[PDB]
UniProtKB/Swiss-Prot annotation, chain C:
Subunit structure: The E.coli AAA domain has been modeled as a homohexamer, in Thermus thermophilus the same domain crystallizes as a homohexamer. Forms a complex with HflKC (formerly called HflA); complex formation is stimulated by ATP. Interacts with YccA, and probably weakly with QmcA. Can be cross-linked to YidC (OxaA) and to a nascent polypeptide chain for an integral membrane protein.
Family: In the central section; belongs to the AAA ATPase family. In the C-terminal section; belongs to the peptidase M41 family.
Stated role: Acts as a processive, ATP-dependent zinc metallopeptidase for both cytoplasmic and membrane proteins. Plays a role in the quality control of integral membrane proteins. Degrades a few membrane proteins that have not been assembled into complexes such as SecY, F(0) ATPase subunit a and YccA, and also cytoplasmic proteins sigma-32, LpxC, KdtA and phage lambda cII protein among others. Degrades membrane proteins in a processive manner starting at either the N- or C-terminus; recognition requires a cytoplasmic tail of about 20 residues with no apparent sequence requirements.
Organism: Escherichia coli (strain K12)
Null mutant phenotype: Lethality, due to increased levels of LpxC, which increases the level of LPS in the cell and results in formation of abnormal membrane structures in the periplasm. Lethality is suppressed under conditions in which LPS synthesis is reduced. Disruption confers resistance to cellular contact-dependent growth inhibition (CDI) CdiA of E.coli strain 536, E.cloacae strain ATCC 13047 and of Y.pestis strain A, but not to CdiA from E.coli strain 93 toxin.
Periplasmic face residues: 1-68
Gene name, Swiss-Prot/TrEMBL: ftsH
Subcellular location: Cell inner membrane
Name of protein: ATP-dependent zinc metalloprotease FtsH
Swiss-Prot record, chain G:
Other facts noted in the record for this chain: Integration of this protein into the membrane depends on SecA, SecY and SecD but not on SecB or FtsY. HflK is unstable in the absence of HflC.
Protein name, as recorded: Modulator of FtsH protease HflK
Chain segments annotated as transmembrane: 3-23
Organism: Escherichia coli (strain K12)
Family from the record: Belongs to the band 7/mec-2 family. HflK subfamily.
Record localization: Cell inner membrane
Lineage: Bacteria, Pseudomonadati, Pseudomonadota, Gammaproteobacteria, Enterobacterales
Subunit comment: HflC and HflK interact to form a complex, originally called HflA, now called HflKC. HflKC interacts with FtsH; complex formation is stimulated by ATP, and with YccA.
Role: HflC and HflK help govern the stability of phage lambda cII protein, and thereby control the lysogenization frequency of phage lambda. HflKC inhibits the SecY-degrading activity of FtsH, possibly helping quality control of integral membrane proteins.
UniProtKB/Swiss-Prot annotation, chain I:
Organism: Escherichia coli (strain K12)
Main location: membrane
Compartments where found: Cell inner membrane
Note: Integration of this protein into the membrane depends on SecA, SecY and SecD but not on SecB or FtsY. HflC is unstable in the absence of HflK.
The protein's assembly and partners: HflC and HflK interact to form a complex, originally called HflA, now called HflKC. HflKC interacts with FtsH; complex formation is stimulated by ATP, and with YccA.
Name of this chain's protein: Modulator of FtsH protease HflC
UniProt record similarity statement: Belongs to the band 7/mec-2 family. HflC subfamily.
Gene: hflC
Membrane topology: Single-pass type II membrane protein
Cytoplasmic compartment segments: 1-2
Amino acid sequence: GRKVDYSTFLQEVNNDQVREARINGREINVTKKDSNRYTTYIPVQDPKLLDNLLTKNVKVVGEPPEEPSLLASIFISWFPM
Amino acid sequence: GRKVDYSTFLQEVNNDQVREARINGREINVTKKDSNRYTTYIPVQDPKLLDNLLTKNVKVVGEPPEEPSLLASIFISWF
Amino acid sequence: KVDYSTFLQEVNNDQVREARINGREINVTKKDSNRYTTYIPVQDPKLLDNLLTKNVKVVGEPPEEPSLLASIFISWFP
Amino acid sequence: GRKVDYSTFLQEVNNDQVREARINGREINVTKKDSNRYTTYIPVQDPKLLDNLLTKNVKVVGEPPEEPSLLASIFISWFPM
Amino acid sequence: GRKVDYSTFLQEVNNDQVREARINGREINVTKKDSNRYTTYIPVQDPKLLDNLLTKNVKVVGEPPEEPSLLASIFISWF
Amino acid sequence: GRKVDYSTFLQEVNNDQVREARINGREINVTKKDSNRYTTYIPVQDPKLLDNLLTKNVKVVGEPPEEPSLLASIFISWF
Amino acid sequence: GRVVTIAAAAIVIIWAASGFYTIKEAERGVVTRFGKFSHLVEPGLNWKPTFIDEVKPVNVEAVRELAASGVMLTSDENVVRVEMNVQYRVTNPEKYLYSVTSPDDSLRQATDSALRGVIGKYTMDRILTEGRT
Amino acid sequence: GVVTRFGKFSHLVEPGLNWKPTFIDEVKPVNVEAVRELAASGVMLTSDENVVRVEMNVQYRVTNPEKYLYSVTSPDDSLRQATDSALRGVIGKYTMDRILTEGRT
Amino acid sequence: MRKSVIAIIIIVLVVLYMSVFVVKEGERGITLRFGKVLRDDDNKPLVYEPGLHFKIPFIETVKMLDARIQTMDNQADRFVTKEKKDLIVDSYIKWRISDFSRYYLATGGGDISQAEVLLKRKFSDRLRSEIGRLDVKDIVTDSRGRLTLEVRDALNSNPNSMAALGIEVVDVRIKQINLPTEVSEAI
């Protein structure tokens, strides 16, 4: 998907433009009002981001972590044997 | 185990529709007042969440840590 | 085994005489010697501030360093 | 590329000279409005940095982490094997 | 190894009676004119500590933490 | 190299005698205006050190990270 | 020579199999060869050969609402504040693709001028209570 | 209790062992047949310019369970959250003094 | 032979267990093969019981859509009457899915969010257009018979219908009316 700058994303949010956002560490998927999609990255840790998102009424979603299966360790350690 | 948005979680906290939720990692086991329960996730590190819980006077219990598992890996390294 | 917020209301009335803190765990030490367990849910900037506001003795404790013999052990015990 | 000092970078930013910034950890590539390029390095965590950038209309960029390729990773894991 | 309390360290600083410290990790080696040697241990990250220290002009030192050079650990790797 | 006090470092910064500072993690390379040189170490994470330095026009430089050599990867691949 | 024939047959079979593709729940689309406009397609059961043509989804039937605002200026030397909302859907994918770039922003920039034009004539109280219709 | 197999209805069960060889059958006993309570209140406006405080309470009972399940969801929500509207409807037309005096008839 | 019989039994059992579909007591469903909703000569089929218990067990999946009377809720929002007085009004909507095929093809995935947004918009619009006319006493005195019913009929009724999207609305009520702080203190 067409990547976008962070500054463009904030100029986006300030104008009632974002519907849903997923947050994973710092990679983000976005869906505008107009049924388009793209991706973005957060460069540096930000305290004021989340509240700025929330106040303007955007739908915000999170994702569960991926836990490494023990069977993967079984394979990698036991591949020689 | 239904998934609920963080936004709606604030939408329910702000008008006091829960008593209790459990805390661990960044996942939350949520229990609204009328005995319905579900789960949510916190997207980032938030400095204001605990204040939102305390000031509104909603009561929240946090849980003990789960020590990692050992014997599986030691057997894996052995056999 | 006792709630974080309840621990907070106990702090508000100045009913705990000193404080034992360790990691995300705090060992309560209140006027009538009752003991229990209470866990830190998430980082709280104000916890140390609030406790220091009310002249409670709050003790630190050494790290629990894993013994070196244990390290070389686990390295070569298998 | 000729490296520069953090302080010089900031001072020149407040002189309204910069247009773009890529960020990855502690490396930051800068392109002026006169189209020259160079690099800098943040000294430490600077909670005010991101603000100071965006508040004067620079076009910031964040770009992804280079995950080690699974094939080469499992190879150099199995290259011993 | 008299473990004089961090909080106790706090009020004794409030009394303005301590004269210098050399810092490392969680450990506070801080001395008063008697040449008193004692120690406490950081409860959790404290922002305000250094500001208060600056108010009392206390001499403060640290050291660059020791790290095992690539001999011993990779030796028990060869062992 | 004279491992001098962080307190002295802050004090002299208040008195404006340094022209250059080079920052490596916790280690501090210093070169003051009258060509004297010394060394100091940062106790813990600081909120205001960078700002305090920047306000009064001391020069600051960092250096890139200590990247591990690939030859270590070769070694670990055969050992 | 048998190995060469078998390899060529396998290559062409993999080619053809990778040619097939899918469309998702009634979204019109335009697929064109070399860039020359070829034909549309309805969802499901379509096959794209490799390195001739390009497949474009349109995501047609969606509701696609936008917004507007502005602290504006009214007739009798007075200042008001208003909002707006508009819903639209796409009929022909072709013209929507090949008229302007980022076509949504076009409707967005148009609606502000439209709203100012309409709000200009009237006066304060009419704008407040009676006359919204 | 309500019993369901093949995704569809199965007969209401008067309490008992209901001797069956099946575990694939799904039975819903969560329903209850005893009285239960909800109550509400509010600072509700008066016919003339006036404000008053009125509160009441309701007691409800389920007759047909399947309409209680496979209809508008979350029962207490609908009950309470329509009772409020009904209470406004009654409280509206009457004057402040009359609400003070004849609140119970 | 025993191996062949066992393998055939396993294959047929897998055919069963990945070919089944289960539709419980009131959750209507859809049918979609890979884009070809199997829109017949008439409207596309609907599915409510595990009849035609077998599907093509690897090419297609189907979606279960709730059919109970769903309830929408919201928060307070300010309004105005012609006497320049301003109120606080809260309300709610009962909505039902009328025609399923149009609903799924339109709303884009059939999760509650976009339907909620669309109904929120249309309701706020029509109600605010209606209450803006009548006078301050007339809201309080007899609001049900005229306001609620008239707004219901107008909002339920081609495109712009709010039914064209495939939604049926049952009835609308108002929950509470407050006043701002200063007027409260004065009275």
